[PDB]
C-alpha cells in the first residue's frame, strides 16, 4: 500500500563526516589517510517525508544525518534488486536489537512496519541461505551515522552530538566512532529507510542523506587524542598545498603541488591488411564427401573468416568447440585453419571427441588430446541413403596399431591374422580391413549417415592470417588518445607526417629509442607521434595569517589551452 | 595479495562413477568479470544477440551453466580434485584465533 509521500530539497554539506579511520591511538600528530569519506561542501539531498520512490541507491557508502526526537526513524534495509530473483538483505534495526536475513526476498512498494510485522518487507525465497542475529544497547541533538561495505565487510560508525536551535548543519567538527562489523559480502546497490506509523496515523519526518567517495584526507589529533581538525586534499589548490606541506598553515611564498596532464579521450587499435574472404562455401557443401578412412583436409589462411555464415551453409543445430567458444571465433586471429571433412555412421559421432576410443578413434581418425577447435556433425539421410543401399563409403576395421594423431591410412591390402602368409588370396586367416557402410532411409537414427567437419586452429606462433574484419578504429587525428597498437600500450597525440619511411618499415624510433613515425597495417599511411601536453602547477599565497586568497600558475604553458 | 594455505588432493576415488559424474557445474558466460572471492548462483538464459531470449534457448541464447564430466578412467587433469583453503585476517582488531599459548 502506497501511503507515504516525499519531497526533496538540497543543501551544501559544509564540513562534516570525519570518522576515526582506524582502531589506533595517536596524539598531537598530523596524519594522512586515504579512504572513503564525504567530500567537503558536498551536495546533500534533504528528504522531507509526510503522510514515492524510496529505492534510494546505496553506492559505495552512505552518510545519514537526522535531528528528530520522536525516534520515528528506525531501521535500514539494504539490497541489490530487492526481489525474488536476486538475494537481498533484511537488516531491521529496532529498539534494542538487530537481525539479518539474506536471500532472494521479494519487496513491495512501501517498506513500512504496521506497529511490528515485517511481512510488508519480504514474503518468501528458496530455503533461505543465511540468518543472523545481534544484540546492541542502542539508545536539540544531531544524530549522524556512516555505513559502508568494504571487501564483503559491513561497518557502521555513529555519533550523537548536541546542537542548539538551528535549521541547518552547524560548523565545527565531530569525530565518529565505530559500533559494528559483519561480513555479508554481496552487491548492495540500494537501500531504504523505515519509520513508525501506528494504526493508521499521520506522520512527519525529515533527514539528510549523502554519498561517500574515495578521497585522501589529512587529520589533526590534539593532545588528548580527539580529532579536532581535518583538511581535504582534492578541493582547492590551497588545500593541495596544505596536504603537500603537511601543515595547516602556509607561509608567504610560492610552492609546487602537483602536475597536470591532458587526459586522452578515446582508444584505438591495430589490425593487419587482410582483404580476402575465406572460402567456407566449398568445404561445407560440395555434393560429395570423402570417406572416413580417407578424410579430406583443406588449409585456409590469408583471408577473413566469417563464422556467422556457417549456419547458413549446413543444417546443423549448434557448434561443439573445446579450446575456444562458438561465440568467440570472430575475435581471435589464427595463423592457419585446418578443415577435415568426412561422413560417418550415426552412433559413431560420439567417437568424434578428444581422447576417444573406438574403431574410428584409433583406426580412421585420431586427434591429439590438446585439440583447440570445433566439430560440426549433421545428418545426411537425404543424400547419402539409397533404397538399394549406399556402398561408396568404407571404413577401416582391422589395423596392426592404433592411429597416431592427425594421421590417415590410404593403403589397401589383405590383412593377415595367422602365421601363414596371405599370399594374395583371401583364404583362412585373411581378411579385408575395409567394410562398406550400409545406409538406408529406413535405418535407425544411430545408423543414419552423418557429415562431420572438424576445424582445427593454430595459435599465435607465426604472423596470423585468419580473423574477423574490424577496422583499425578508423585512425583518428589531432587528439590525445589511448592505444594498444600490436601489444604496445600507451598514449599520445597523432598527426600527419613529412618523413619518407622506406617501403617496409613498421616502427621508427628516435634518439631516445622511442617511436616517432609510424605506418598502418590496414592502410599504408605515414603518421607522426607527439607526447600530449603536460606541465606543473604552482600556487602563490600570502601568509595564512593574512588572507586565504591564492593564485595558480601553470609552468611553461601558453595561456590558451589551460 | 593472497596469504594463506592451500591443500589439494585428488578425489577420483569418490567423485567418479561408471556412468559419469555430473554433480558439479561451472559458469561459462558472464557479462562482467568477477570480483575477488565472489560467487554467482543466479541462473538465467544468457543472451548473445540483439533480440531478447524470452526464456527460450534458441538462436543466440545460451546456458551459462555447464555440467562437469567426472569419470575414474579420465586423465589426471580431468580427475576431480578437492581443495581446502585457509585465509587469515591479520592483527587489526582484537585477535581471536591462535594456538594454545600459556599465559
Amino acid at each position: 500500500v502506497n501511503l507515504i509521500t516525499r519531497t526533496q530539497s538540497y543543501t551544501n554539506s559544509f564540513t562534516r563526516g570525519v570518522y576515526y579511520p582506524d582502531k589506533v591511538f595517536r596524539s598531537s600528530v598530523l596524519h594522512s589517510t586515504q579512504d572513503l569519506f564525504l567530500p567537503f561542501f558536498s551536495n546533500v539531498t534533504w528528504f522531507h517525508a509526510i503522510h514515492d520512490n524510496p529505492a534510494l541507491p546505496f553506492n559505495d557508502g552512505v552518510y545519514f544525518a537526522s535531528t528528530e526526537k520522536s525516534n520515528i526513524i528506525r531501521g535500514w534495509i539494504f539490497g541489490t534488486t530487492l526481489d525474488s530473483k536476486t538475494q537481498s538483505l533484511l537488516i531491521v534495526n529496532n529498539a534494542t536489537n538487530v537481525v539479518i536475513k539474506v536471500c532472494e526476498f521479494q519487496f513491495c512498494n512501501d517498506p513500512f512496519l504496521d506497529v511490528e510485522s515485517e511481512f510488508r518487507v519480504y514474503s518468501s525465497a528458496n530455503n533461505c541461505t543465511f540468518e543472523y542475529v545481534s544484540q546492541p544497547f542502542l539508545m536539540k541533538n544531531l544524530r549522524e551515522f556512516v555505513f559502508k561495505n568494504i571487501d564483503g565487510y559491513f561497518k557502521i560508525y555513529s555519533k550523537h552530538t548536541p546542537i542548539n536551535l538551528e535549521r541547518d548543519l552547524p560548523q565545527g567538527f565531530s569525530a565518529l566512532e565505530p559500533l559494528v562489523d559483519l561480513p555479508i559480502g554481496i552487491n548492495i546497490t540500494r537501500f531504504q529507510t523505515l519509520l513508525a506509523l501506528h494504526r493508521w496515523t499521520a506522520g512527519a519526518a525529515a533527514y539528510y542523506v549523502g554519498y561517500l567517495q574515495p578521497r585522501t584526507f589529512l587529520l589533526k589529533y590534539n593532545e588528548n587524542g580527539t580529532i579536532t581538525d581535518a583538511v581535504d586534499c582534492a578541493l582547492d589548490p590551497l588545500s593541495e598545498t596544505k596536504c603537500t606541506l603537511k601543515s595547516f598553515t602556509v607561509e608567504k611564498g610560492i610552492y609546487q603541488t602537483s602536475n597536470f596532464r591532458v587526459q586522452p579521450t578515446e582508444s584505438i587499435v591495430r589490425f593487419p591488411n587482410i582483404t580476402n574472404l575465406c572460402p567456407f562455401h566449398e568445404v561445407f557443401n560440395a555434393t560429395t564427401f570423402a570417406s572416413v578412412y580417407a578424410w579430406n583436409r583443406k588449409r585456409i589462411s590469408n583471408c577473413v573468416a566469417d563464422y556467422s555464415v556457417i549456419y547458413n551453409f549446413a543444417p546443423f543445430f549448434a557448434f561443439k568447440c573445446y579450446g575456444v567458444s562458438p561465440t568467440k571465433l570472430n575475435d581471435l586471429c589464427f595463423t592457419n585453419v585446418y578443415a577435415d571433412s568426412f561422413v560417418i555412421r550415426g552412433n559413431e559421432v560420439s567417437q568424434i571427441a578428444p581422447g576417444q576410443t573406438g574403431n574410428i578413434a584409433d583406426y580412421n581418425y585420431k586427434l591429439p588430446d590438446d585439440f583447440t577447435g570445433c566439430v560440426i556433425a549433421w545428418n545426411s539421410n537425404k543424400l547419402d541413403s539409397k533404397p538399394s543401399g549406399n556402398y561408396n563409403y568404407l571404413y577401416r576395421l582391422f589395423r596392426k596399431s592404433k592411429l597416431k594423431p592427425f594421421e590417415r591410412d590410404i593403403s589397401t591390402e589383405i590383412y593377415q591374422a595367422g602365421n601363414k602368409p596371405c599370399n594374395g588370396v583371401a583364404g583362412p586367416n585373411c581378411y579385408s580391413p575395409l567394410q562398406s557402410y550400409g545406409f538406408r532411409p529406413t535405418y535407425g537414427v544411430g545408423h543414419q549417415p552423418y557429415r562431420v567437419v572438424v576445424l582445427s586452429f593454430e595459435l599465435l606462433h607465426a604472423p596470423a592470417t585468419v580473423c574477423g574484419p574490424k577496422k583499425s578504429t578508423n585512425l583518428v587525428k589531432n587528439k590525445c588518445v589511448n592505444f594498444n597498437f600490436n601489444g604496445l600500450t600507451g598514449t599520445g597525440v597523432l598527426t600527419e607526417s613529412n618523413k619518407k619511411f622506406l617501403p617496409f618499415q613498421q616502427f621508427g624510433r628516435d634518439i631516445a629509442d622511442t617511436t616517432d613515425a609510424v605506418r598502418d597495417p590496414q592502410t599504408l599511411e605515414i603518421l607522426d607521434i607527439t607526447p600530449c601536453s603536460f606541465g606543473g602547477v604552482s600556487v602563490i599565497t600570502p601568509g595564512t595569517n593574512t588572507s586565504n586568497q591564492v593564485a595558480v600558475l601553470y609552468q611553461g604553458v601558453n595561456c590558451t589551452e589551460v | 595479495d593472497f596469504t594463506g594455505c592451500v591443500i589439494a588432493w585428488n578425489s577420483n576415488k569418490l567423485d567418479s562413477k561408471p556412468s559419469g559424474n555430473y554433480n558439479y557445474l561451472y559458469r561459462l558466460f558472464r557479462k562482467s568479470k568477477l570480483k575477488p572471492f565472489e560467487r554467482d548462483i543466479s541462473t538465467e538464459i544468457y543472451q548473445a544477440g540483439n533480440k531478447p531470449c524470452n526464456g527460450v534457448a534458441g538462436p543466440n541464447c545460451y546456458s551459462p551453466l555447464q555440467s562437469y564430466g567426472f569419470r575414474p578412467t579420465y586423465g589426471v587433469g580431468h580427475q576431480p580434485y578437492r581443495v581446502v583453503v585457509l585465509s587469515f585476517e591479520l592483527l587489526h582488531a582484537p585477535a581471536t584465533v591462535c594456538g594454545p599459548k600459556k599465559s
Partner: nanobody
Framework: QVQLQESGGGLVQPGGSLRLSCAAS????????IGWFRQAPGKEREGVLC????????LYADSVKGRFTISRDKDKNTVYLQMNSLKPEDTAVYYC??????????????????????WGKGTQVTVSS
C-alpha cells in the same frame, strides 16, 4: 543430506479423489527436474508427470492427462498432486523421485524418464473396482 519422504495414499472407490505429496529435504541443486513414477505388480515403472522448477512448465502423460493435477511449492520444497476420477487401471505402487536437469545445446531443458539420481520409498494406491 538430500532425502525424499512421501506421505498419503490408501484405498478408495473408483472415481474418488486423493491427495499425495512428497517432500524434498536438504535439496541443493539449483536446476532440477523431479520425476514421478508408478509400477503396478507385474509391469515396468513409467513416468507420470512433471513440471519445470524455474517457472512451472507443466507436462502430463497420455493415460493420466487432465486427471492428474500437479503443483510444486518451493516454500516447503515439496510436490503436491490432486488425483480424481480413479479407475482400476491406476492401481500401482507410486514412487517420487528427483533428478538434475540436462544441459545440452546451451539451454535449460527439463527431462524425466530414466536416469534419475534420487528416489523415494513409495506408497500403495489401491482402487476397489
Amino acid at each position: 543430506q538430500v532425502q525424499l519422504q512421501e506421505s498419503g495414499g490408501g484405498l478408495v472407490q473408483p472415481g474418488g479423489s486423493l491427495r499425495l505429496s512428497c517432500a524434498a529435504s536438504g535439496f541443493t541443486l539449483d536446476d532440477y527436474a523431479i520425476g514421478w513414477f508408478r509400477q503396478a505388480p507385474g509391469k515396468e515403472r513409467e513416468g507420470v508427470l512433471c513440471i519445470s522448477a524455474s517457472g512451472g512448465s507443466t507436462l502430463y502423460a497420455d493415460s493420466v492427462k487432465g486427471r492428474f493435477t500437479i503443483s510444486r511449492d518451493k516454500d516447503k520444497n515439496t510436490v503436491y498432486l490432486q488425483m480424481n476420477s480413479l479407475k482400476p487401471e491406476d492401481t500401482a505402487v507410486y514412487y517420487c523421485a528427483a533428478a538434475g536437469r540436462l544441459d545440452l545445446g546451451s539451454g535449460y531443458v527439463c527431462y524425466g524418464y530414466y536416469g534419475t539420481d534420487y528416489w523415494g520409498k513409495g506408497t500403495q494406491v489401491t482402487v476397489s473396482s
